[PDB]
Nucleic acid binder design. Structure first.
Ligand SMILES: [Mg+2]
Ligand SMILES: [Mg+2]
Length: 540
DNA sequence: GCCACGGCGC
DNA sequence: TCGCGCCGTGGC
């Protein structure tokens, strides 16, 4: 029968819990329960009952750990069947989906969530038997990383609220300028944020050619690609593109941020998820750091809003060209390995191979071509796309791509080898054995198959880079704790720390060493490090 | 409020 | 022709 016993539960019990909202730093803990041997213990008062647990063990353990940290408790996350499920198949991203797939039901009751957690753990543990690489990732990466991510989310980061107000005003003033010019050209006002109203203005009123159509609704598209053709010829088009860029930035990364400053901490608590992506990269939300513009002065001015506490400094560490380094390692291409061992400017050096010239004779446009292919090769960038990117003819783009593979032939071979592995086994894997299933390599529709192919050889590269970072995070954490420093943010191939100004230089030196030495590859791992009062200044 | 949707950032 | 999360729109 359904066994119940009073709170507190025995040691090693799985926990279940219900939040008032999904963000643990912002939620009330409504209910707390634990289960062992299928026997459920329900906490009369959940906040007091947290004190009784030595560990958060169960579904979404990291999230409960974040809320306990907020409350001044140290409840480190342990086993979590979500992490097992994600290793079995990274399409496993939510408790609901995991329950549906492997058994049971994700409900809204803490006791049931606790019992479910225990059953799923045993189930998924059994399904992993013999999978030694995935089990190594669980023990050395996923479980210990969950505790690091709890601390990052709970600690949060200070924002420069005066600066954000100044930036908001500047962007608002530019937006106002552009809409007035658009309304001047259209001869009347309308909602520039409405694609339906803009469609009418551009194509019916102004009579512009309508190239493409929308995916579902079957209307004339007003997308960037469709307007690109019209840009040079029609001023109103250019103004709309500028307008869209600024309003996207404002509404996503300027307007939301102060409301995310918690009343209790005086900090922004970015949420970090380790079971959200197909590749094994971490994701962030509230805000999504990954989608902050990387080019443009505007992306950079968002980062200036992120600041150190008074008396402290931010330390920013970035793995230079890590995906390309991983490609050199996985492919074993001797010439690409030479590019990295010569150890001068990587894109200049890549260009010298491609074009057959001494590095001194590589000009900035040749370098840009190499740099662009060094990014694009990783996912099969088309020659059409390269020709757009470089503003050169299609045939010349094709030639550049072939020049690249001629210099780096084992990269060409590795891509095909990886596709054969995917076709044979149904999955591809990273250096560490993180696995993604790739069923549509067999697809009949060429377009679907070719996207499947691109996802298939890109994942081992991105996923290896992801796990190198996560291992470094695991290794670095205890070394920072003992200096009074901490990790705050992770995005792309970058890690942002906060340290007291007196310890900042030593922390930079320690973190660089830990990151560069995390795992041996056929080429060196290189880390760029900078220190500053704000995140933009710490890029250096 | 819910949803699907276009559009765009990485 | 370069999947997913984000925003605002418009229908209900
Ligand atoms: Mg959509
Ligand atoms: Mg509405």
């Amino acid at each position: 029968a359904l066994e119940e016993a009073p709170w507190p539960p025995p040691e090693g019990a799985f926990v279940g819990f219900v939040l008032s909202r999904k963000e643990p730093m912002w939620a009330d803990l409504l209910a707390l329960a634990a289960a062992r041997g299928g026997r459920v213990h329900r906490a009369p008062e959940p906040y007091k009952a947290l004190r009784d647990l030595k560990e958060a063990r169960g579904l979404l353990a990291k999230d409960l750990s974040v809320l306990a940290l907020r409350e001044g408790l140290g409840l480190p996350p342990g086993d979590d069947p979500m992490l097992l499920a994600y290793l079995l198949d990274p399409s496993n991203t939510t408790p609901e989906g995991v329950a549906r797939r492997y058994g049971g039901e994700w409900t809204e009751e803490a006791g049931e969530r606790a019992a479910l957690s225990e059953r799923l753990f045993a189930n998924l543990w059994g399904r992993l038997e013999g999978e030694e690489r995935l089990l190594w990732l669980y023990r050395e990466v996923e479980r210990p990383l969950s505790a690091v991510l709890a601390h990052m989310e709970a600690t949060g980061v200070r924002l420069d609220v005066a600066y954000l107000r100044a930036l908001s005003l500047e962007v608002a003033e530019e937006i106002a300028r552009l809409e007035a010019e658009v309304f001047r050209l259209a001869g009347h006002p309308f909602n520039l944020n409405s694609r339906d109203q803009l469609e009418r203005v551009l194509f019916d009123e102004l009579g512009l050619p309508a190239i493409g159509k929308t995916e579902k609704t079957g209307k004339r598209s007003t997308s960037a690609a469709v307007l690109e053709a019209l840009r040079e010829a029609h001023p109103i088009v250019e103004k709309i593109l500028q307008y869209r860029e600024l309003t996207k930035l404002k509404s996503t990364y300027i307007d939301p941020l102060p409301d995310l400053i918690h009343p209790r901490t005086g900090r922004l608590h970015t949420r970090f998820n380790q079971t959200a992506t197909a590749t094994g990269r971490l994701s962030s939300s509230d805000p999504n750091l990954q989608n902050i513009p990387v080019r443009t002065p505007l992306g950079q001015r968002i980062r200036r809003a992120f600041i150190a506490e008074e008396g402290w400094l931010l330390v920013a560490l970035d793995y230079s060209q890590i995906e390309l380094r991983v490609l050199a390692h996985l492919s074993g291409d001797e010439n690409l390995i030479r590019v990295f061992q010569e150890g001068r400017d990587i894109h200049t050096e890549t260009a010298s191979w491609m074009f057959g010239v001494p590095r001194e004779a590589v000009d900035p446009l040749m370098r840009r071509a190499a740099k662009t292919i060094n990014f694009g090769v990783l996912y099969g960038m088309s020659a059409h796309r390269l020709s757009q990117e470089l503003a050169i003819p299609y045939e010349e783009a094709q030639a550049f791509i072939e020049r690249y593979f001629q210099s780096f032939p084992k990269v060409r071979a590795w891509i095909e080898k990886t596709l054969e592995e995917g076709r044979r086994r149904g999955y591809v894997e990273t250096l560490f054995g993180r696995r993604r299933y790739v069923p549509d390599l067999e697809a009949r529709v060429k377009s679907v198959r070719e996207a499947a192919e691109r996802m298939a050889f890109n994942m081992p590269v991105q996923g290896t880079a992801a796990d190198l970072m996560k291992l470094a995070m695991v290794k670095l954490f205890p070394r920072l704790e003992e200096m009074g420093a901490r990790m705050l943010l992770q995005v792309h191939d970058e890690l942002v720390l906060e340290a007291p100004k007196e310890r900042a230089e030593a922390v930079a030196r320690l973190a660089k060493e830990v990151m560069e030495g995390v795992y041996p590859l056929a080429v060196p791992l290189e880390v760029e490090v900078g220190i500053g009062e704000d995140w933009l200044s710490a890029k250096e």
